[PDB]
Design a protein around this motif. Structure first.
Motif, PDB file in Angstrom:
ATOM      1  N   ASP A 121     -71.553  68.251  90.569  1.00 27.00           N
ATOM      2  CA  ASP A 121     -70.401  67.553  91.094  1.00 27.00           C
ATOM      3  C   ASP A 121     -69.435  68.615  91.618  1.00 27.00           C
ATOM      4  N   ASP A 123     -67.438  67.976  94.298  1.00 32.30           N
ATOM      5  CA  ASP A 123     -66.239  67.334  94.829  1.00 32.30           C
ATOM      6  C   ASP A 123     -65.305  66.925  93.691  1.00 32.30           C
ATOM      7  N   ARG A 124     -65.716  67.279  92.478  1.00 26.99           N
ATOM      8  CA  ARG A 124     -64.856  67.263  91.300  1.00 26.99           C
ATOM      9  C   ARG A 124     -64.363  65.865  90.910  1.00 26.99           C
ATOM     10  N   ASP A 125     -65.167  64.832  91.161  1.00 29.21           N
ATOM     11  CA  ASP A 125     -64.841  63.476  90.696  1.00 29.21           C
ATOM     12  C   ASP A 125     -65.557  63.015  89.429  1.00 29.21           C
ATOM     13  N   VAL A 127     -68.902  62.605  89.036  1.00 30.27           N
ATOM     14  CA  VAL A 127     -70.251  62.094  89.276  1.00 30.27           C
ATOM     15  C   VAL A 127     -71.010  63.098  90.153  1.00 30.27           C
ATOM     16  N   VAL A 128     -72.328  63.185  90.003  1.00 28.21           N
ATOM     17  CA  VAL A 128     -73.053  64.209  90.733  1.00 28.21           C
ATOM     18  C   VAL A 128     -73.554  63.648  92.061  1.00 28.21           C
ATOM     19  N   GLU A 129     -72.920  64.084  93.150  1.00 27.06           N
ATOM     20  CA  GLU A 129     -73.255  63.626  94.501  1.00 27.06           C
ATOM     21  C   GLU A 129     -74.555  64.264  94.994  1.00 27.06           C
TER      22      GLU A 129
HETATM   23 CA   LIG Z   1     -68.940  64.273  92.603  1.00 24.53          CA
END
Ligand SMILES: [Ca+2]
Ligand SMILES: [Ca+2]
Ligand SMILES: [Ca+2]
Ligand SMILES: [Ca+2]
Ligand SMILES: [Ca+2]
Ligand SMILES: [Ca+2]
Ligand SMILES: [Ca+2]
Ligand SMILES: [Ca+2]
Ligand SMILES: [Ca+2]
Ligand SMILES: [Ca+2]
Lengths: 655, 655
Positions: A121, A123-125, A127-129
Motif C-alpha cells: 500500500d 498510496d497509504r490508505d 489497502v494494498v492496491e
Molecule cells: Ca493503498
C-alpha cells in the motif's frame, strides 16, 4: 521496459513473457547464410510489429508479407494477457533465399505470458492496491507515496520477555495487525515452463531491518513462516496457476538511526536456470520500498490519556492531591510505588504510526544498571539506545518537545524536540551522541539543543514548559525566572512582609528560619541568581529564535536557585515550571513560599499570571512527607497523550 | 534575532551590541520596590521603543514622557551603525514613585555596537560577498546557494611525497589558490569592551574534514598559520578596530563518503567572560557552511587533452600507430614503459571543480601491493580507497561513465557511472563496498551496476563503450556481439571463404591453423558464445533502461570468447570495443580476423558500421610483439579529458 530476446539459428526459442514488458526480437542472426527475405506468422494474443530502422509496422497473424533481411530490421513483440492452458502463443519466422518463394528455413519463438507484481500500500490508505507505479520510490508530503512499516517493538504475549521483533518467530495472530501487507499477485497457466522459478529476496544490509512472514493454514492450525530476515536473504516461491495471490506480512526490526535512513527494499525475480554451476539469470525483477515509521514525541498541548505517577507509598498528600487533580479530567491515573523520579527520568512516551495502525512506544534512558522493560506489552512498545559514559543530561527530564510551530515560514507540524546541552567550547556535559543521533534520525521533530548545563541535575524540564491557552489553538512557553522572584520578594518586603517565613510546616527546615529578609540580605545568593537569570535568558533567546516565539508567547514564573561548587544551580524552593499539564488543568509543585495573609505569595502570584487565561491551578505537595526540601524532588509524573492528528508522512523535512 | 538584555537593579549594565540584532530590555526588574512610573533618555545613535504588551512606540532622545511600570511594558533597543571612539551610546531609565516628579533611582545601559560577519562566496561567483543571507545553508541547483570547497589533494612541491591536505602546513603561496576564501569582517571602536573576545571554531567531527589558514606578513617573509583543523578546534581572533577584514583560506581534507555528506561548517562567536571557572557565554554566533566538491568522471564524449599509454619499450607497432593516431588530433601523447595494463586498470582520471578553481584528480585502484602516486603533482590530484579482499572487479577497467542522459524525464547532466557486478543471489564477484560507497557518495553521477562477472577478468570495458556521433550532440553505445561475429563468419563461409585464416602474422598461433571453418565447426564454442550473447543482452537491457537508450543508439561490434573452468569468458581475438576515443578518431584494437581479399573481414565490417557516421577508424596492433594472443592485452591507454561545461552544483540530485 523493453527486453532482448533473439531467435536462435536455427533452433526454436521458448521464453517466458512478463506482462508490462515487451520484447525486441532479432530475426537476422537466426537466418541461414545467404537468405534474402523473411516473413512471419503469429498467434491471436501475440502482437507483432516489424521495426525497420526505427519505423514500426503492425503485422497480421497470417499474412504473406516479406521484408529484406537486415540487422536493423527487427521485431517488437507484445502481449496484453497472461497465457492459459488453452494458449498457444507463438511467433514463427520463415526465411527465403533469392530464388523461390518456398521457405528455406524457419525459426520460432514460443511464449508463455505471466503476470508478476509485488504489491504494497504505497498510496497509504491501508489497502494494498494493484501495482502502484510509484511503489518503488518513497516520497514525503501530502502528494507523496510509498509504503510504511512499523518497528514491531511491542509484545503480544507476556510469556516471553523481549519485544516481538527480537526473534524470527510469530506466535499470536494479533502480531500480524502490527505488520504491513505485501502481496505477490500472479496470473498464468498451470505451471511455469521448465527452468524457471520465482524468488523473493532482500539485501544482506536490510536483513537486520526487516522480517517477512507467510501465513499457512495446514491441518492442525494456523502457522507463520519467517521467509526473509535475519539469516534468510531469499525465499523460493511456490507458483500456483490461474490468478493467484500470496499474502506476506512485513515487520520493521529497528528505527532509523545514524547510518540507517529508514528505507528498506524487497524484491521478487523470475529466475531462469541456465545450467549446472551457472548462476540463474534474473529475467524480470519487481521492487517495493518501505519506510520504517519514526518514533515521535508528544508535546503538552496534545490531549492527555493516562497520568503515570511514581512516589513512595506513604506520601499521602501527593497521592490525594494528584488523584484530585486527575478527577477533574477524563484521564486515568496509574500509580507505582530505578530512581525516585524514574517515571519522568527513565522513560519517554512517544508513538509510531502507519496508515493501518499505530501504538504508543516507550523510549528507555541509557544505563541505573538495569533496563526498564515492565511497560512493554500489547500495543505498548519499547525502544532503547546503549552508549560514551552516561551523565545526568541523558535522563529524559532533559528531553522535551515543543508544540507545532512555524519559523521563518518553515512549518514544523509535529513540534521540535528540545534537549539540554552545554556551550560548544565549554567542555561541559552533553547528552550521549547515541541518543542525540537517534532523535535526529527520526527527522520529523528536527531537534534543538538548549543550554541546561548551568543546572546541577542539568534538565530542560527544571527551567521550562509549555501549556495550551484554553479556548484557543495557541500555547505559552513557561520560563523559570529569578528576577520575577526577587521583584516579588522586594515588593512584599517593602509592604512590611520581610519577616514572612518560607517552608512553613516543613519541620526539618524550621531551625533555619528562612524569611524574605534573610533571602534578600544574602548578597552572594543575589549574585548567583543574577547569573542564573543570564543562563535562563540565553535559553529564552534560543527558544524564541528556533520556535518562532515573541515575548507575547512567554510567561515568567518566579524561581530561585542555590549554587554548588561547580557553579551549577539547584532549586532553592520547588520548581513550579515542571508541572502536570492536563489541558486547562495544571498540577503545579507547591513552592512553600512566604506566607502573606495566610496564603503563599508565590501561589497567589502564579494564580494571577495563569488564571486570567482560563488555566486552572492546583498546587501539589510532594515534599511534606520528607519534612524539608534540599533541592531534590522524590516524585515523578509522566503524561501519555494522544498522537498528533497530522500524519507524519505528510511532512516534508529538509534534505 | 532579538536578544535579551535586562537592566540591573540598580547597577549600570554595559553590553556589546552586534549589528543585525536588537535587544528587548526589561526595565521593570531594576525598578526599586514601590516605584510607579519610568521615563527614559537615550543617545543619538540608539533607537528606543517602548513596547507595552505588544504595542511599540518610538521615543525621543530626551523627552519627559512617563509610562506605568509593568512586567509587560519593556523596551526594544536598536542600533544601525557601529560605535567609534567618538561614540557614547546609551539608554538611561529613570524611576519615580507615586509622590513627586523627581527620579528616585536610575538604571542605565551603556552600549558598544560592533559589526561581526563571517563571509564566504555563497553565490558561487568566485568573490566573497558581504553577509550573504543564505551563507548558512547549502542548496543544489541553478537557483541554489552556498559555498564550495575543494579537497586539496594535489601537491604543490615535489620535495614532499603526500598530497597537500595530509598535513597542517602550508609552504607554497600557490597552495592558497586551491583554497576557498572566508573573510571575517568587523567594524567597531579601538578595542572590544572588557571581558569579550572573538573566537572561530569547528566541531570535533569536522576537524578531519577541513583546515583553515591565516596569512601573516611579518618581517622575514610571508607565513601561513594553521588555525583550525586536525587537533585545533578553535582559534581566538585578535580584534582590530575600525573597519577590518581578516582573510582566511579553507581547504577540504576529504571527499564525501559513506557517513560523510560533504557538508562542513565554521563558526565565529563573540564570547563574554563571566568569571573564573565559568564557561564564557556565546553572545553572538555567525555560521558559514561549505560543501566539499565531489570527484567526477569524464565520459568518452568530452574533448580529449592527453592520451596516456603504457606498453613495453619494444612494442614498436603499437607505439608508432598510437603516435600516428594522436597526430591526427590536437592531443598530447604521454608514454610510460604495476600491471601491464596499469594505466587503464589502476587509475581513473576524474576532476573536481569549485567556482574559483578546478583540477584533474586521479583515483587509485585499491591494493598491486604499492600505491601509484607518481602522477601526483601541481593541479593534478590523488585520491584512493583502501578495503574486504580485492578482486579483478576492483580494477578501473571495470569503472566507466555514460554521456549525459535523460531517463523518464530525469536528467543526468554529468552522465552515470557504470560498474560491473554479479547477480544479487549469484554469490559472484563484486567491486569492494568501500569503492562503491565512495562513488555513490559523490552523488552527481548516480552509479549503475552492470553484469560483468560472466567475464574472467570481469570488466565492463571488455564488452561496451561510448562514442560521440560527429557533427551532432548525440552518442552511441557500442556493444560486443558474438551473434554479429557468427553471422559474419557464416556469410564468409557461404561465400567460399571457410579456409580463411585468422591470426595471420602471429607466429606463435600458426601451428593452430585457425580458420573460419574450424571456428564454425566447434560445437561447444558455439554454445559458449550463445550463452555469452545472453550475458551481453542482459547488459544491453539494463543500459537501455538506466540510460534511456533505444536500439537506434546502439551499434553491435563482432566479438568472440572462449570459456574457462568457471564458465567465464575471455576474448578469442582482441576486443575491438575497448578503443581509444578521440572525438571522430578511434583507435581500435587490431582483431587479426580472417583475411578475405587481403583485408581483415572484421576490420572491413567495423569500418562499414562506423565510417558512414563520420567516425574515422585506425586499427592499432598491440599483440604482434608477443607473437600470439591468449586473451590478454599487454598495453593500456587512458584519455584525460576536459571537464563538463555544466557546473555540478547546478544539478539537483535525488534526496
Ligand atoms: Ca493503498
Ligand atoms: Ca516475533
Ligand atoms: Ca507485535
Ligand atoms: Ca500489537
Ligand atoms: Ca521528558
Ligand atoms: Ca560571491
Ligand atoms: Ca598542506
Ligand atoms: Ca594544493
Ligand atoms: Ca594547486
Ligand atoms: Ca575506466
Amino acid at each position: 521496459r523493453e527486453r532482448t530476446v533473439r531467435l536462435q539459428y536455427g533452433s526454436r526459442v521458448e521464453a517466458v513473457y512478463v506482462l508490462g514488458t515487451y520484447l525486441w526480437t532479432d530475426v537476422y542472426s537466426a537466418a541461414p547464410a545467404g537468405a534474402q527475405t523473411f516473413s512471419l506468422k503469429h498467434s491471436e494474443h501475440v502482437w507483432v510489429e516489424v521495426v525497420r530502422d526505427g519505423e514500426a509496422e503492425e503485422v497480421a497473424t497470417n499474412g504473406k508479407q516479406r521484408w529484406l533481411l537486415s540487422p536493423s530490421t527487427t521485431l517488437r513483440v507484445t502481449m496484453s494477457q497472461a497465457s492459459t492452458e488453452a494458449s498457444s502463443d507463438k511467433v514463427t519466422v520463415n526465411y527465403y533465399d533469392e530464388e523461390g518463394s518456398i521457405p528455406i528455413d524457419q525459426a520460432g519463438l514460443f511464449l508463455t505470458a505471466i503476470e508478476i507484481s509485488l504489491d504494497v500500500d504505497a498510496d497509504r490508505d491501508g489497502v494494498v492496491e494493484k501495482n502502484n507505479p510509484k511503489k518503488a520510490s518513497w516520497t514525503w508530503g501530502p502528494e507523496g507515496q510509498g509504503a510504511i512499516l512499523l518497528v514491531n517493538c511491542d509484545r503480544e504475549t507476556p510469556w516471553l520477555p523481549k519485544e516481538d521483533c527480537r526473534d524470527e518467530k510469530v506466535y499470536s495472530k494479533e502480531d500480524l495487525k502490527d505488520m504491513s501487507q505485501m502481496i505477490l499477485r500472479t496470473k498464468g497457466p498451470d505451471r511455469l515452463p521448465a527452468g524457471y522459478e520465482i524468488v523473493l529476496y532482500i539485501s544482506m544490509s536490510d536483513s537486520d531491518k526487516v522480517g517477512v512472514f507467510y501465513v499457512e493454514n495446514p491441518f492442525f492450525g494456523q502457522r507463520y513462516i519467517h521467509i526473509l530476515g535475519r539469516r534468510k536473504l531469499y525465499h523460493v516461491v511456490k507458483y500456483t496457476g490461474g490468478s493467484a495471490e500470496l499474502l506476506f506480512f512485513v515487520e520493521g526490526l529497528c528505527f532509523p538511526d545514524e547510518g540507517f535512513s529508514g528505507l528498506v527494499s524487497i524484491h521478487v525475480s523470475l529466475l531462469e536456470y541456465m545450467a549446472q554451476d551457472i548462476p540463474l539469470t534474473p529475467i524480470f525483477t519487481d521492487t517495493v520500498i518501505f519506510r520504517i515509521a519514526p518514533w515521535i514525541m508528544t508535546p503538552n498541548i496534545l490531549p492527555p490519556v493516562s497520568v503515570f505517577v511514581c512516589c513512595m507509598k506513604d506520601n499521602y498528600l501527593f497521592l490525594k492531591e494528584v488523584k484530585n487533580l486527575v478527577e477533574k479530567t477524563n484521564c486515568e491515573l496509574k500509580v507505582c510505588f530505578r530512581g525516585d523520579r524514574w517515571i519522568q527520568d527513565e522513560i519517554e512516551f512517544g508513538y509510531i504510526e502507519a496508515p493501518h495502525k499505530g501504538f504508543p512506544v516507550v523510549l528507555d534512558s541509557p544505563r541505573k544498571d538495569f533496563p526498564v522493560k515492565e511497560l512493554l506489552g500489547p500495543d505498548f512498545g519499547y525502544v532503547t539506545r546503549e552508549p560514551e559514559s552516561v551523565t545526568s543530561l541523558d535522563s529524559f527530564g532533559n528531553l522535551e518537545v515543543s508544540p507545532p510551530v512555524t519559523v521563518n515560514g518553515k512549518t514544523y507540524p509535529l513540534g521540535r524536540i528540545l534537549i539540554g546541552s552545554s556551550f560548544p567550547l565549554s567542555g561541559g556535559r552533553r547528552m550521549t551522541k547515541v541518543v542525540r543521533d537517534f532523535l535526529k534520525a527520526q527527522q520529523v521533530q528536527a531537534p534543538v539543543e538548549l543550554y541546561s548545563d548551568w543546572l546541577t541535575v542539568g534538565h530542560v524540564d527544571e527551567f521550562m514548559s509549555f501549556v495550551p491557552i484554553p479556548g484557543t489553538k495557541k500555547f505559552l512557553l513557561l520560563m523559570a525566572s529569578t528576577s520575577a522572584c526577587y521583584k516579588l520578594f522586594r515588593e512584599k518586603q517593602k509592604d512590611g512582609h520581610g519577616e514572612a517565613i518560607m517552608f512553613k510546616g516543613l519541620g526539618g527546615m524550621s531551625s533555619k528560619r528562612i524569611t524574605i529578609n534573610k533571602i534578600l540580605s544574602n548578597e552572594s545568593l543575589v549574585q548567583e541568581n543574577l547569573y542564573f537569570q543570564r543562563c535562563l535568558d540565553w535559553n529564552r533567546d534560543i527558544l524564541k529564535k528556533e520556535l518562532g516565539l515573541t515575548e507575547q508567547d512567554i510567561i515568567d514564573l518566579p524561581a530561585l536557585f542555590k549554587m554548588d561548587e561547580d557553579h551549577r544551580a539547584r532549586a532553592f524552593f520547588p520548581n513550579m515550571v515542571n508541572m502536570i499539564v492536563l489541558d486547562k488543568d495544571l498540577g503545579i509543585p507547591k513552592p512553600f513560599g512566604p506566607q502573606v495573609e495566610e496564603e503563599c505569595c508565590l501561589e497567589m502570584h502564579v494564580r494571577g499570571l495563569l488564571e486570567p487565561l482560563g488555566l486552572e491551578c492546583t498546587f501539589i505537595d510532594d515534599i511534606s512527607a520528607y519534612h524539608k526540601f534540599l533541592g531534590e524532588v522524590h516524585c515523578g509524573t509522566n503524561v501519555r497523550r494522544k498522537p498528533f492528528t497530522f500524519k507524519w508522512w505528510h511532512m516534508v523535512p529538509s534534505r
